[PDB]
Structures are given as C-alpha cells and as structure tokens.
Amino acid sequence: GIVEQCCTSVCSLYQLENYCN
Amino acid sequence: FVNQHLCGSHLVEALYLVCGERGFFYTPKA
Secondary structure (H helix, E strand, O other): HHHHHHOOOOOOOOHHOEEEE | OOOOOOHHHHHHHHHHHHHHHHEEEOOOOO
C-alpha cells in the first residue's frame, strides 16, 4: 500500500501519481 | 519534494498537491 511505499520507505512521484484519479 | 518519507497528514498533503483537480484516493490499509 501507499503507506508501506511512501511512509515506511522513501516515496516517489511515480507512486503518488498511481493514486490520483 | 516527494522523494522522502511522507507519513500521516504530510502524505495526504502531498497527494493533494501532486494530483490537483484530478483528486486522489487515500488507502492506508489495503
């Protein structure tokens, strides 16, 4: 999930944009 | 500003800024 990928580990623009509508 | 550890309201804030008028969905569990 987003928390594992962006909180627990360093986030990226690619991963953020996956959660845009 | 997105290449770092983003937790809680800070992560949600980043989604808000990046996604813009597209909006986003925030799912901390699944």
